[model samples]
Target: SAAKGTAETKQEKSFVDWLLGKITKEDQFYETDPILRGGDVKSSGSTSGKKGGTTSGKKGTVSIPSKKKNGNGGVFGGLFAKKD
Candidate 1:
């Protein structure tokens, strides 16, 4: 069940602090400061080019998630579907 909170006045608790504080062994929140673990922002001197390009002469590639192809249905019908 989702926990609900009520604000007595116009002010409420910090959403980030509350979520971080309550996160325990099983529940975890995504880290944004560090680049690696699915963080949209990159860090300094990291592969994201805060300092510069890679020293190894190899360019870094960012991995983006791709969704499986599904046929369009309903309203527009297959108008969105790709044609071979």
Candidate 2:
């Protein structure tokens, strides 16, 4: 029984937040601040510089999960058995 996890919204980081969260000072756990270190917090220098959005990078349309039962049914079919 997989127990339900905690609420992600408590510390939800948006796209912009994740893009810039790499510069956070995780070492100094006691001293946390917004836009700290007086560094280039306002600039997007570390970004990889590409398009952004909820891009659905999918293809082949995700294989079906129902009929994939392998070895459960052997090669023999009931069609020949029905003739009897």
Q: What TM-score goes with each of the models?
A: 0.13, 0.20
Query: So what's the TM-score on candidate 2?
Result: 0.20
Write down the TM-score for model 1.
Answer: 0.13
C-alpha RMSD (angstroms) for model 2 = 22.0
Candidate 1 residue runs with Cα over 4 Å from true position: 1-65, 68-74
lDDT of 1 by residue, 15-54 (tens): 8656766574333564454556665654566455467555
Report how far residue 82 has shifted in candidate 1, in Å.
1.2
> What lDDT tens digits, residue by residue, belong to model 2 across residues 21-43?
66773344643454568444475
Maximum-TM-score candidate: 2
Off by over 4 Å in 2: 1-29, 33-42, 49-62, 71-84
RMSD of 1: 19.4
Which whole-number lDDT from 0 to 100 does residue 53 have in model 1?
Answer: 55
* Candidate with maximal lDDT: 2
Per-model lDDT = 0.55, 0.57
